[PDB]
């Protein structure tokens, strides 16, 4: 089925009455508001679009204001879509809350990872370092050979080298749902999820 | 050729319909339809069907023979029918029938169930016998082979699922 | 280039290049490929007349 | 089964067949007489 959009708050622990500590991640999941319903006769596929959050009125351009005003909702801090299955239906203006996950056991979480900038082969691809003594000359953390010889006489596409690391989309799968709280808008999952404190997350029911 | 040069008689009470290359045969035991290869001519005079080659094809006679055999089998099946018998040998081996499912215990660690297709009936006189009744020779044979394949006979004692009139050889270690 | 244009022109009237040239040889016409192509493009009634003469010769 | 470039009849109960472009020998008495040309 569909999922929701939340924000990353931090990490803590839960003690159990039988003497166990569970490391959990705290996600704040406010209400999600339906802005558009896309169907098969006019668009070609079945999906819904949702918004969440709040945004100041002096930073909202006129096209965005019109798009929100046609639906009849206030402005949020983004727009996302979720594909619909066979037998699911929603209406424009409707609100969806965290209690959708009341009976779910496991979830999949998607986010954006922390950035590291330019990185080398030791850090990016786990290459092994050469000797530190015994006569080495300016070649300690360098990669080494990158090809064979006259045959083929080039470097193959996809070779592992240095460059940008981090700051991209990452999914993590099959995480237990430790707690759902509706009066507070809280979801506590077990483990860790990609991103930093104060970032947008997408939470879905497990696919496997 | 020598097989296609013998007409097939239609006993009283059997209806035959011919439309292009499609043939339908109906009678007391039921209904059977088929489509023939595009090299044969079939003619119905008063009480018999005759098969022959068309023109412009290089393998008419073999196809005619095959078609003759097929229609003879259909004619027999639409009135009398066909039967198959299966036997079980071993210790702790048995079979039972409910509705259209045969449950077999054959020395495994899990149950084995087999779901019959449409048009075949099954029964068990004793715990160690199966009888299959039907109107289609090919389907009855396929079901018998399927049932056999679960636990084939072995050459040191003979345990397994076998045919009624099959001789199974044995050798010594 | 001239030969290709002549082939195209003759196939619309209903004959092929080789047969057309054979018919002209048997009828004793002595026009060449340059003039033939020029006429095929700029005047079509005369080309039909030539094709008819070649067909009569072949028949 | 025997994979050989020379396939023959070894006893009187053997038969030679052509299946799917391949020549084979099948015996109804001895399982050791089964041959395939390849």
């Amino acid at each position: 089925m569909i999922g929701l959009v939340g924000k990353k708050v931090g990490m803590t622990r839960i003690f159990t009455e039988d003497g166990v500590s569970i490391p959990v991640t705290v996600i704040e999941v406010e209400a999600n508001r339906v802005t558009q319903v896309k169907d098969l006769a006019n668009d070609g596929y079945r999906a819904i679009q949702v918004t969440t959050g709040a945004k100041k009125a002096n930073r909202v351009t006129k096209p965005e204001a019109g798009h929100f005003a046609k639906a009849g909702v206030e402005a949020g801090r983004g727009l996302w879509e979720f594909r619909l299955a066979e037998g699911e239906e929603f209406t424009v203006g409707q609100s969806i809350s965290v209690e959708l996950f009341a009976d779910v056991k496991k979830v999949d979480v998607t986010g954006t990872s922390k950035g590291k900038g330019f990185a080398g082969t030791v850090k990016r691809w786990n290459f092994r370092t050469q000797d530190a003594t015994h006569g080495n000359s300016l070649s300690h953390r360098v990669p080494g050979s990158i090809g064979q010889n006259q045959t083929p006489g080039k470097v193959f596409k996809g070779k592992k080298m240095a460059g940008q690391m981090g700051n991209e989309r990452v999914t993590v799968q099959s995480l237990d749902v430790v707690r759902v709280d509706a009066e507070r808008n809280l979801l506590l999952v077990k483990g860790a999820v990609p991103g930093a404190t104060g970032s947008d997350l997408i939470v879905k029911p497990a696919v496997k | 050729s020598r097989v296609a040069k013998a007409p097939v008689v239609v006993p009283a009470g059997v209806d035959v319909k011919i439309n292009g290359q499609v043939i339908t045969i109906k009678g007391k035991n039921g209904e059977l339809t088929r489509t023939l290869n595009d090299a044969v001519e079939v003619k119905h005079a008063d009480n018999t069907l005759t098969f022959g080659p068309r023109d412009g094809y290089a393998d008419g006679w073999a196809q005619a023979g095959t078609a003759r055999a097929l229609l003879n089998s259909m004619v027999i099946g639409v009135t009398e029918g066909f039967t198959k018998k299966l036997q079980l040998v071993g210790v702790g081996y048995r079979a039972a029938v409910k509705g259209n499912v045969i449950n077999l215990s054959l020395g495994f660690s899990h149950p084995v169930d087999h779901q019959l297709p449409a048009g075949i009936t099954a029964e068990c006189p004793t715990q160690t016998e199966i009888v299959l009744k039907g109107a289609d020779k090919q389907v009855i044979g396929q079901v018998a082979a399927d049932l056999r394949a679960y636990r084939r006979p072995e050459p040191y004692k003979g345990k397994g699922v076998r045919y009624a009139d099959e001789v199974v050889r044995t050798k010594e270690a | 280039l001239w030969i290709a244009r002549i082939n195209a022109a003759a196939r619309q009237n209903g004959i092929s290049y080789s047969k057309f040239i054979n018919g002209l040889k048997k009828a004793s016409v002595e026009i060449d490929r340059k003039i033939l192509a020029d006429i095929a493009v700029f005047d079509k009634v005369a080309f039909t007349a030539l094709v008819e003469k070649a067909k009569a010769a072949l028949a | 089964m025997k994979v050989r470039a020379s396939v023959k009849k070894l006893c009187r109960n053997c038969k030679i067949v052509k299946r799917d472009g391949v020549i084979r020998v099948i015996c109804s008495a001895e399982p050791k007489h089964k041959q395939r040309q390849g």
Binding site: K157 | - | W2, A4, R5, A8 | -
Partner: protein, 142 residues
């Protein structure tokens, strides 16, 4: 006088429609290529385009002889080491039926900018319905 040469600013072109049910692939592709290039007009000029527009219907029903439905293999390479890939005629008809005729015709045209420009006048559909009735095409029996 000098020999005649055609001019792209004044050239006539026409729209034709063809059906491909039960027809041999290569013996259809030859005619398509010939009429796309324009070898059927007395104004043929090697350095100009003089052809016509052709619509092709029912591309999922071409015919091949022999055992080619299962034994004809299409190859390609992805540019990465080890990236050789293949498909069969049946699989092509099941996934992308138009690509078959398109490849056949593309192999039979001149190589260069002008051949690429000639290829753009070919419309191939998998069904029996086009949406080009505003151009009024004429039926062509090949």
């Amino acid at each position: 006088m000098k020999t005649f040469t055609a001019k792209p600013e004044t050239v006539k072109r026409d729209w034709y429609v063809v059906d491909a049910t039960g027809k041999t692939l290569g013996r259809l592709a030859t005619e398509l290529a010939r009429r796309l290039r324009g070898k059927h007009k007395a104004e043929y000029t090697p350095h100009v385009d003089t052809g016509d527009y052709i619509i092709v219907l029912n591309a999922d029903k071409v015919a091949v002889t022999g055992n080619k439905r299962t034994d004809k293999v299409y190859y390609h390479h992805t540019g990465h080491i080890g990236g050789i890939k293949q498909a069969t005629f049946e699989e092509m008809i099941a996934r992308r039926p138009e690509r078959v005729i398109e490849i056949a015709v593309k192999g039979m045209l001149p190589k260069g900018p002008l051949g690429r420009a000639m290829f753009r006048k070919l419309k191939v559909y998998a069904g029996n319905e086009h949406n080009h009735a505003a151009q009024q095409p004429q039926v062509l029996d090949i």
